[PDB]
Amino acid sequence: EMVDNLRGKSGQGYYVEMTVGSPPQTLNILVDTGSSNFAVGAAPHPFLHRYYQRQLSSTYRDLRKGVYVPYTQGKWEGELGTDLVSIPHGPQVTVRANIAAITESDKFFIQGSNWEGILGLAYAEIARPDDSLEPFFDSLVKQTHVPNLFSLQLCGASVGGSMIIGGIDHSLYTGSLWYTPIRREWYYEVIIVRVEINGQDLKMDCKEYNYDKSIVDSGTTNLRLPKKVFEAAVKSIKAASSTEKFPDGFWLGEQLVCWQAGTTPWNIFPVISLYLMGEVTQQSFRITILPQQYLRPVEDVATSQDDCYKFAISQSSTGTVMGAVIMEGFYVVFDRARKRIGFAVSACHVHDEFRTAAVEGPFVTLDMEDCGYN
Numbered sequence: 001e002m003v004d005n006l007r008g009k010s011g012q013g014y015y016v017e018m019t020v021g022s023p024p025q026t027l028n029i030l031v032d033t034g035s036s037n038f039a040v041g042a043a044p045h046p047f048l049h050r051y052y053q054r055q056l057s058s059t060y061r062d063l064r065k066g067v068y069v070p071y072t073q074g075k076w077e078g079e080l081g082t083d084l085v086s087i088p089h090g091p092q093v094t095v096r097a098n099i100a101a102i103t104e105s106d107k108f109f110i111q112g113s114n115w116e117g118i119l120g121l122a123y124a125e126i127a128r129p130d131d132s133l134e135p136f137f138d139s140l141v142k143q144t145h146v147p148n149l150f151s152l153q154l155c156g157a158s159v160g161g162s163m164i165i166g167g168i169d170h171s172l173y174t175g176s177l178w179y180t181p182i183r184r185e186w187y188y189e190v191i192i193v194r195v196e197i198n199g200q201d202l203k204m205d206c207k208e209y210n211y212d213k214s215i216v217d218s219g220t221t222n223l224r225l226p227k228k229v230f231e232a233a234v235k236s237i238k239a240a241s242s243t244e245k246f247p248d249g250f251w252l253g254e255q256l257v258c259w260q261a262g263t264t265p266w267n268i269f270p271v272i273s274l275y276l277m278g279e280v281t282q283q284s285f286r287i288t289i290l291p292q293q294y295l296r297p298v299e300d301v302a303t304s305q306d307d308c309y310k311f312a313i314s315q316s317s318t319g320t321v322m323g324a325v326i327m328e329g330f331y332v333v334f335d336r337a338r339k340r341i342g343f344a345v346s347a348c349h350v351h352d353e354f355r356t357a358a359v360e361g362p363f364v365t366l367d368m369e370d371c372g373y374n
């Protein structure tokens with residue numbers, strides 16, 4: 001019943017339908033494992049088709065406290081309160097939850113995105129103003145009998161997917177689920193132990209891959225990498241694809257690359273393998289990323305004699321972010337109850353006739369180094 005309950009536009013997030021207040025007000029809400037505040041547009045905005053009207057909800061309670069939340073992209077400010085919330089195509093329950101009513105924002109809402117708010121699915125430790133503001137999923141678990149776990153199947157301009165709350169839907173993946181430990185419960189922080197481009201190790205001290213943290217983040221589009229790792233990755237992808245020369249602006253994500261419709265040279269771009277820490281000492285597994293994932297299609301009727309793409313790997317000063325283009329084609333299980341993240345090949349997996357995205361292991365390392373940065 002919960003399958004295919006996500007929609008979205010490429011590069012603009014995935015959202016689920018929710019209702020807030022009594023009587024229920026329907027809003028589309030972006031699913032974000034990279035933050036912990038539930039917030040909704042609550043005042044008119046040029047890019048909002050609708051917004052939360054507190055005056056029409058008898059169950060709304062003002063907490064008489066303001067809140068400000070800056071993301072990597074965009075920021076908003078709002079007023080804290082609580083109200084009743086439901087998920088029409090999720091669990092059939094109603095819970096009272098904290099809600100930030102967004103009254104002002106900057107570069108947060110996206111023109112034509114079809115969502116009006118954001119659902120932060122991470123832990124209280126990174127909630128604003130502080131960790132006493134209980135996140136939605138915590139409220140959901142406390143107030144209902146829903147198991148402490150959710151899974152995301154994000155599929156690759158209209159896109160779709162499934163958010164399954166309370167369990168795992170085996171129809172959504174094939175093969176085995178591999179688990180990596182959640183290192184610390186704030187973001188969904190994980191540990192990358194090795195990175196290869198077309199089978200070739202980048203050969204860095206593995207702490208570099210996790211400077212200063214690595215997270216799984218559905219609310220971020222790109223694979224974001226620490227500067228040192230980003231430069232190494234680009235050098236290696238350039239080398240692999242050297243049969244064609246692209247403008248420096250493409251690698252900086254400032255420019256599109258286009259080919260005649262249907263002629264994208266996928267084969268000249270390498271597969272990227274990210275090895276994640278396993279649940280056993282010095283063991284790991286890898287997820288493999290095809291160019292069909294990290295070259296993101298940019299839909300534009302004006303350019304449609306061609307297929308055009310943006311490079312969806314970018315530089316970070318705040319650690320590695322495994323964003324939506326990494327999650328796409330995998331079934332990702334956020335197993336909060338057992339403090340682990342599971343990965344499996346998704347039913348909507350990425351592949352052509354030569355290569356397939358994969359989740360595989362086990363791999364062993366002799367080096368006994370802890371790859372966590374802290």
Ligand SMILES: CCc1cn2c3c(cc(C(=O)N[C@@H](Cc4ccccc4)[C@H](O)CNCc4cccc(OC)c4)cc13)N(C)S(=O)(=O)CC2
Nearest residue numbers: 011012013032034035070071072073074219220221222314
């Ligand atoms: C999906 C819209 C989007 C596009 N892009 C990006 C983007 C970042 C974020 C981003 O910051 N997303 C946060 C949520 C969000 C979703 C839609 C629109 C605006 C923001 C996400 O929560 C980031 N999670 C890490 C983080 C960083 C800083 C403060 C936080 O506070 C708790 C959380 C969103 C987009 N870039 C930096 S990027 O390199 O992935 C490429 C462009």
